[PDB]
């Protein structure tokens with residue numbers, strides 16, 4: 001297990017998200033689904049010139065998995081995945097630029113999507129987020145952070161996932177509405193209805 | 205005809221786009237098509253709760269219309285359109301916030317889309333841009349700017365659009381490659397292949 005410091009602007013943004021009241025927190029699910037959709041676009045595009053890209057799994061989909069016993073909501077996709085370097089260095093498109101100005105726009109949370117840092121909206125509703133991911137060119141890794149200025153990266157020895165990413169949201173006590181079938185259906189309808197991949201909401 | 209000064213940050217933005225060389229100009233088309241796709245999502249979503257929102261036209265599509273003789277490329281969509289207030293005040297999502305930090309990021313151009321100001325990428329390839337639009341709640345209007353810090357708004361008397369927006373790009377002398385069927389097809393395939401509405405090129 002390696003433990004890393006967040007980029008300064010990201011630590012700042014995370015503190016803001018966790019320690020400030022925002023109303024319309026449901027948009028976290030729109031941002032995660034948007035990210036999954038983009039990751040799906042990426043592998044799909046690569047597959048068009050190299051079909052072997054899909055040897056790690058042909059299905060291109062998004063799954064929503066509420067677990068009331070564990071108090072987790074999991075968003076799984078079979079998109080391009082992330083390498084260990086992605087997990088340590090962050091993705092090129094997440095950087096101080098998108099972050100810096102958005103906080104100054106805050107000081108509605110929903111415009112986070114616009115600035116390419118939508119993932120961190122997960123911290124509106126989750127006390128801890130685990131990102132398990134597998135890219136064609138790397139092994140399976142687990143990234144995790146409960147904020148506090150650091151994240152961990154470790155090999156994931158667990159369930160081999162083929163290719164893609166799982167975001168496990170360990171929900172805050174007062175945010176369990178996001179485990180209810182009806183609430184999740186409503187949010188998907190309102191914000192992610194026309195996403196171009198199947199979104200399957202698991203039943204408990 | 206009413207003439208308005210741009211918001212300071214937008215003037216700044218446009219000048220930076222126009223007066224600096226950027227290689228990857230083809231992303232303007234991606235941006236315009238992304239804006240059309242979003243506009244189509246918005247009317248489609250309204251239509252689910254009030255079918256009469258489509259009295260102004262049921263088809264949800266994007267058309268690309270090159271015109272070598274006029275040296276124009278027109279991008280038409282049947283999305284939600286914009287009102288006079290939209291054309292004067294700008295859209296809520298385009299704001300000094302998205303703008304200012306993008307410029308500091310600049311000083312890849314492709315990152316423009318991330319920050320909600322993708323429309324202004326048109327000035328990479330166009331000396332003038334005309335936006336003709338019709339929203340269900342308002343009359344048809346023409347918005348126009350050759351940059352240089354001002355734009356105009358007038359009631360539009362031309363061909364009725366029903367509902368939606370036409371962006372007419374009056375191309376720079378050295379950017380006529382974007383009127384070529386081959387080039388347009390290549391760009392759509394590279395950057396817009398999985399857009400969830402039909403994109404149709406009207407060949408000359």
Ligand SMILES: COc1cccc(C(=O)N[C@H]2C[C@H]3CC[C@@H](C2)N3c2ccc(C(=O)NCc3ccccc3)cn2)c1C
Pocket residue numbers: 004005006007008010035036037039077079082086087088089090091094119131143165167
């Ligand atoms: C399906 O698509 C997904 C799914 C799940 C997460 C993400 C995503 O946005 N991931 C990134 C943000 C979060 C989540 C995992 C990882 C990469 N991550 C990181 C990684 C590193 C950093 C970081 O701050 N690294 C240190 C650093 C220091 C100085 C400069 C730059 C980075 C921040 N966030 C995406 C795109």
Ligand SMILES: COc1cccc(C(=O)N[C@H]2C[C@H]3CC[C@@H](C2)N3c2ccc(C(=O)NCc3ccccc3)cn2)c1C
Pocket residue numbers: 208209210211212214239240243281283290291292293294295298323335347369371
């Ligand atoms: C299909 O989707 C389309 C198609 C065509 C254009 C657009 C779009 O992004 N339009 C906006 C940006 C461009 C193009 C039309 C209009 C609204 N527009 C404006 C309008 C006003 C302004 C402006 O600066 N107004 C003055 C102002 C001063 C001080 C504060 C705020 C505004 C800038 N851009 C979109 C979203």
